[PDB]
A and B are shown apart, each in its own frame.
Chain A
Amino acid sequence: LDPVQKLFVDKIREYRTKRQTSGGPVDAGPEYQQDLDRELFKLKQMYGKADMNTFPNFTFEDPKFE
């Protein structure tokens, strides 16, 4: 064959179309969402429920000595 780049055009088109109509799962419809929501929770479990928009800081003390 011969069309190399004319095929790539055909693929290209839809990439922009979706981006310029963003909303939900993008023409996917709810179906992408239903998985996503679980996945995002699961990843929280790997780091525990520590907030990620906070900065942590604490003090630290002393024990018995000699």
Chain B
Amino acid sequence: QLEEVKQASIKQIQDAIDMEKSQQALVQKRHYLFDVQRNNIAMALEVTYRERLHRVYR
């Protein structure tokens, strides 16, 4: 009797805990992913403007 109660105990909470942890992660991480990409873009261009100024002044 007692075995099944504790056994079921792990398995039911497991599937929850894992899925609520999965849900929370994707929100921030996916917004971070978007973010980082914007990041990488912006940089390059100011660089491109910057480089032209050095080049022509030389």
Interface residues of chain A, those whose CB is within 8 Å of chain B, are 56-57, 60, 62, 65-66
Contacts and interface: CB of A to CB of B under 8 A. Distances in A.
Interface of B: 37, 40-41, 48, 52, 56
Contact of B56 (A56, A62, A65, A66): A56
Nearest to B36: A66
Contacts of B52: 60
B41 A65 contact: yes
Nearest to B41: A65
Contacts of B48: 60, 62
A31 B9 CA distance: 107
Contacts of A62: 48
